[PDB]
């Protein structure tokens, strides 16, 4: 029984440490910057098919607003499978969802930052209020929605300004108009 | 227009 | 012997989980929304007299301002014992108390939110500067002060819009005028 | 006027 | 294996407990208030030469801006050794450094607060953009830079308004002009 | 200008 408690406390720690990790990243003004380090390795795991996508830490539109996160496929998804970097927006089940207006209807802007401040890969969209991706969450996360053809897998190949020090920066901006 | 993940 | 040391850690980690939980809730603009889940059970524990009151997580007027929290009695307190929901405001001992002006003299507004955004139970008050509830804290928490007859226990009984999904939302707004 | 808890 | 397993976990905890201690102190508007408790002992450990300096928790100019902290020598450093309280500013290695402009070029104002809101010890400075203290961090922390002769060790002697309840407050203000 | 720590 004593040996058990050991293996148990070890995981309970990973969760708390993960919860602290999320905490350090959450923002509450609708502007989020996601840093993905160890890019090469993660990019490989995606091409290899071992880990197709990664979720970013959660962020909010306001202190008690919508809870959201991003989901990225380093080797593309659907119509961008294998050819592009696919970036999606995710509406998460929030603590105060009962106090918010549904469906989610805020404009979202996704960006792959040029670490030379040059040409930033940018794309935006307005939610389709009839889509399940923007209705009030029933599960932890709604179906991700966004850009399957966000960025050609070549625009971030060998010598480019998006990947630097084996890390990339994704930025999201959620318009707060009407909230 | 957003496209859903598969 | 080794069984003792293991519990030691498990306890310490419980505390850390509590602290992180606290931070996840603190705000610094004087506006606070408290979500009380598992309401029916908590309501019961109060009627049964086993747990008369609950303290909310702490919140602040500014990053280095007053530290405050709320205290609720799901089955009333004092003149409202057994007939009303009693809601109070609490001035807590803050780290920066030495830098703040005393006694606390900010207007406070307490609310029980209608989850149908219709009729919110609202009440407000201005501190009685001679009350010990607003003197600079000597202990962790000053004597709570507020509304003993905030809301009739019938307003949130059975079929109503305040209790939904077995949870209610309390909101506090601390006027920042003069700070 | 605020009333103190009991 | 027991002394080994239980041993490692204690370190990871110290870290997590540290990360969490940092987070609750960090601000993101360039204004920081550092509370130093147990002053008498800390002051002594500096005079005795066991602990010459202390680093404050980190703070930022914006959510994804520069990471900074302060370093104090309760018994002076360099030209202020033994005669003054020396206070320095520190540019730390930030998560988003690659996205920021270098060298660091923001005006910094340091203050030792009078707990009687009377006369605050104040000094400010503009970075020397060619100094190593302000180039992009290569290690965790760049060399601290600031005020070796911030405050005479006598000002905060016996009967004064800076030390109260065996604690002092240091405040830093980082001008955000241009960011 | 700021003076570096020693």
From Swiss-Prot, chains A, C, E:
It is found in: Cytoplasm. It comes from the Eukaryota. Phosphorylated at several serine residues within the first 128 amino acid residues. Residues 29-174 form the MATH domain. Signal peptide: none annotated. Homotrimer. Heterotrimer with TRAF1. Heterotrimer with TRAF3 (via TRAF domain). The domain containing the RING-type and the first TRAF-type zinc finger can also form homodimers (in vitro). Interacts with TNFRSF1B/TNFR2. Interacts with TNFRSF5/CD40. Interacts with TNFRSF4, TNFRSF7/CD27, TNFRSF8/CD30, TNFRSF9/CD137, TNFRSF11A/RANK, TNFRSF13B/TACI, TNFRSF14, TNFRSF16/NGFR, TNFRSF17/BCMA, TNFRSF18/AITR, TNFRSF19/TROY, TNFRSF19L/RELT and EDAR. Stimulation of TNF-alpha receptor TNFRSF1A leads to the formation of two distinct signaling complexes. E3 ubiquitin-protein ligase that regulates activation of NF-kappa-B and JNK and plays a central role in the regulation of cell survival and apoptosis. Catalyzes 'Lys-63'-linked ubiquitination of target proteins, such as BIRC3, IKBKE, MLST8, RIPK1 and TICAM1. Is an essential constituent of several E3 ubiquitin-protein ligase complexes, where it promotes the ubiquitination of target proteins by bringing them into contact with other E3 ubiquitin ligases. The coiled coil domain mediates homo- and hetero-oligomerization. The MATH/TRAF domain binds to receptor cytoplasmic domains. Belongs to the TNF receptor-associated factor family. A subfamily. This is TNF receptor-associated factor 2. It comes from Homo sapiens (Human). The gene is TRAF2. The chain holds residues 323 to 501 of 501 of the full protein.
């Amino acid at each position: 029984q004593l040996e058990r408690s050991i293996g148990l406390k070890d995981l309970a720690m990973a969760d708390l440490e993960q919860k602290v990790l999320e905490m350090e990243a959450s923002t509450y003004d609708g502007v989020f910057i996601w840093k993905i380090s160890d890019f090469a390795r993660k990019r490989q795991e995606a091409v290899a098919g071992r880990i197709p996508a990664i979720f970013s830490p959660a962020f909010y539109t306001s202190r008690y607003g919508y809870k959201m996160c991003l989901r990225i496929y380093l080797n593309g998804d659907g119509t961008g499978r294998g050819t592009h970097l696919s970036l999606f927006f995710v509406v998460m089940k929030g603590p105060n969802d009962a106090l918010l207006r549904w469906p989610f209807n805020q404009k979202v802007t996704l960006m792959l930052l040029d670490q030379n401040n040059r040409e930033h890969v940018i794309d935006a969209f307005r939610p389709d209020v009839t889509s399940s991706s923007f209705q009030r969450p029933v599960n932890d996360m709604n179906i991700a929605s966004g850009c399957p053809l966000f960025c050609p897998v070549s625009k971030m190949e060998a010598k480019n300004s998006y990947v630097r020090d084996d890390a990339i920066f994704i930025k999201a901006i959620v318009d707060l108009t009407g909230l | 227009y957003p496209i859903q993940e598969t």
